[PDB]
Design a protein around this ligand. Structure first.
Ligand SMILES: Cc1nn(CCO)c2c1C(=O)CCC2
Length: 109
């Protein structure tokens, strides 16, 4: 299936991202109790557990929807955290990895 080809490609990419050594900050939703005013600043929170659910739920009917969510994970983090924080470092490392995988899968060419 053309839908099911997409699904496989996205699942492979998301799995690789989740397995990456720098994915650990992004594995679950930011906790309100740990991040003061995070949910006042960041309007569209996202994390890799929520993306896994969305994927299983057949939400990612296009590459664009998938890339927007995953990009939001990094840019939320970079907006909120200090530039030399461990979280910011992880976000940019993982983002580099993400762009290399989407290129390699021909999701952008
Ligand atoms: C703020 C903030 N605090 N925590 C830890 C609590 O969830 C995290 C953040 C992020 O911005 C992304 C990584 C995880």
């Amino acid at each position: 299936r053309d839908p099911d080809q997409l699904y496989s490609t996205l699942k492979s990419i998301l799995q690789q991202v989740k397995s990456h050594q720098s994915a650990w900050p992004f594995m679950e939703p930011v906790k309100r109790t740990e991040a003061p005013g995070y949910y006042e600043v960041i309007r569209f929170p996202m994390d890799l557990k929520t993306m896994s659910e969305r994927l299983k739920n057949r939400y990612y009917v296009s590459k664009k929807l998938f890339m927007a969510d995953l990009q939001r994970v990094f840019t939320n983090c970079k907006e909120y955290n200090p530039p030399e924080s461990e979280y910011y470092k992880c976000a940019n490392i993982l983002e580099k990895f993400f762009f290399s995988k989407i290129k390699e899968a021909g999701l952008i060419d």
